[PDB]
Amino acid sequence: DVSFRLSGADPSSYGMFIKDLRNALPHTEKVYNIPLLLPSVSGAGRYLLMHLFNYDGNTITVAVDVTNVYIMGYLALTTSYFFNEPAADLASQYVFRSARRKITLPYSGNYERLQIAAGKPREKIPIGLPALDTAISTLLHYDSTAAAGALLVLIQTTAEAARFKYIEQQIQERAYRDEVPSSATISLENSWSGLSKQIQLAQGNNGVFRTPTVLVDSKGNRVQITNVTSNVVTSNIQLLLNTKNI
Numbered sequence: 571d572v573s574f575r576l577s578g579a580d581p582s583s584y585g586m587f588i589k590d591l592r593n594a595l596p597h598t599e600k601v602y603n604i605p606l607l608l609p610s611v612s613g614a615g616r617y618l619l620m621h622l623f624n625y626d627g628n629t630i631t632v633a634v635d636v637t638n639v640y641i642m643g644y645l646a647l648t649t650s651y652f653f654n655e656p657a658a659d660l661a662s663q664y665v666f667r668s669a670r671r672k673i674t675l676p677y678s679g680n681y682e683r684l685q686i687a688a689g690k691p692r693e694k695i696p697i698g699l700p701a702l703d704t705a706i707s708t709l710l711h712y713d714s715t716a717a718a719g720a721l722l723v724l725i726q727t728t729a730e731a732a733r734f735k736y737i738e739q740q741i742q743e744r745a746y747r748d749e750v751p752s753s754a755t756i757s758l759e760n761s762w763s764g765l766s767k768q769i770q771l772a773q774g775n776n777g778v779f780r781t782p783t784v785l786v787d788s789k790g791n792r793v794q795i796t797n798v799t800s801n802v803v804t805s806n807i808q809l810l811l812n813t814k815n816i
C-alpha cells in the first residue's frame with residue numbers, strides 16, 4: 571500500500587508520496603527509460619490501496635488499478651464507493667469486501683462524466699494540497715454532487731501527478747494555496763494515452779512519433795511533440811499506458 575498524510579504535509583513529503591505511488595505500480599520493462607505499465611494483472615494484485623489522511627487524521631482508502639492508474643473506488647469508514655462502470659464493478663469483487671455497505675456513485679470515473687456531475691469543468695476547480703485535504707474530508711460523507719468535484723481533485727493530485735512530473739510540480743507549488751490547473755496540466759491529462767502510445771510506437775520508428783501530439787506549454791502556447799527527445803518524454807511523463815490498453 572501507499573500512504574499520505576495531509577497533517578504536516580509539505581512539497582517534499584508530497585513528492586515522496588508521489589514517488590512511492592509510482593514505485594508501487596509494477597512493470598517488467600522501461601520504454602525509453604519510462605516504466606511501461608503491464609497490459610493486465612490477475613486477481614486482487616491489480617489494485618493498489620492508497621491510504622490518505624486529512625488534516626484531522628480521518629482516512630479514506632482509495633483503490634487504484636495498477637495497469638492504468640485509474641481510481642476504481644474508495645472506502646470511507648465502513649462504506650465503499652465505486653464508479654458506475656464495468657471496471658469498477660469488477661474491482662468491487664476484490665477490494666473493500668469487509669465494508670458494511672457498498673454504494674455505486676451515479677457516474678463513471680471519466681473526466682467528462684465527473685465534470686457533468688460536479689457542474690463545472692476541471693479548468694475552474696482549484697487543486698493543491700489544501701484542495702486534497704478538502705476532497706478527502708468530503709468523500710468521508712456521501713454527497714454525490716460534492717463527491718464528483720472531490721474526485722476530480724483527487725484524480726489530479728494523485729494519479730495525474732504520478733503520471734507526470736510537471737503535474738506533481740504544479741501540486742507542489744500549490745502546497746499552501748490552491749489554484750486552478752494550468753492549461754498545460756489539462757493538456758497532459760488529456761494526452762496521456764496518446765503520448766503513451768506514440769512513445770511505444772517510437773520504438774521501431776527510431777524514437778520518432780508515428781503521429782505528433784499537440785500540447786499546450788507552460789507559457790500557454792501550442793506545441794507539437796514529434797519525437798522522444800522532447801522534454802515531455804525525457805523529463806516529464808513518468809508511466810506509460812500499455813498500448814494493449816489503447
Ligand SMILES: *[C@@H]1O[C@H](CO)[C@@H](O)[C@H](O)[C@H]1NC(C)=O
Pocket residue numbers: 778796797799800801
Ligand atoms: C524532435 O524534437 C525536437 C525537440 O522538440 C525538435 O526541435 C526536433 O527538430 C525534432 N526532431 C525530429 C528529428 O523530428
